[PDB]
């Protein structure tokens, strides 16, 4: 019931490139607040790179920072927040779990929204872990593979063809 955790302003058009990362954040507010936090942290860092001075962008980022400060406080004594190494592993491993879920569906020839979303979200989470520093080679490889699969399978199903 912290007011700072209430919804943000509408996303500025300048920040279109982080719309899906922010959506991922909010879909995890209950499910996994650690993921919710770091997705917002990435959105904040990326948004500042893009535009922190245009009034709408400055206002949006100011509210996002309010929400980050509140959420960090509320997460309290959480290892994945107090220890960057653990936070990075938490996100990397959550990405890997949905990646391997989607891979298992793919290998079985089971194509559906959930595994498409799992591939795509895995790729978004690898974007997010750039907040911890340089990506590993395997990070780069997984993000590319996952986003390719999400796009490819989606397009095939849209056209009625088996991937």
């Amino acid at each position: 019931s912290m007011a700072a955790l209430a919804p943000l302003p509408p996303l500025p058009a300048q920040f279109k490139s982080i719309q899906h990362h922010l959506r991922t954040a909010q879909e995890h507010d209950k499910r996994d607040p650690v993921v919710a936090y770091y997705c917002r942290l990435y959105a904040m860092q990326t948004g500042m790179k893009i535009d922190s001075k245009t009034p709408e962008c400055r206002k949006f980022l100011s509210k996002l920072m309010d929400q980050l400060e509140a959420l960090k406080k509320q997460l309290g004594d959480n290892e994945a927040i107090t220890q960057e190494i653990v936070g990075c592993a938490h996100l990397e491993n959550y990405a890997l779990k949905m990646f391997l879920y989607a891979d298992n569906e793919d290998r079985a020839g089971r194509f559906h929204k959930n595994m498409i979303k799992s591939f795509y979200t895995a790729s978004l989470l690898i974007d997010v872990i750039t907040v911890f520093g340089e990506l590993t080679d395997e990070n780069v490889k997984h993000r590319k593979y996952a986003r390719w699969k999400a796009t490819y399978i989606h397009n095939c199903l849209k056209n009625g063809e088996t991937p």
Binding site: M48, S52, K53, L61, M65, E69, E84
Partner: peptide
């Protein structure tokens, strides 16, 4: 840019 938002951002990471 080095502004007040980036300074608040750095404080989160401390």
């Amino acid at each position: 840019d080095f502004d007040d938002l980036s300074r608040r951002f750095e404080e989160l990471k401390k």
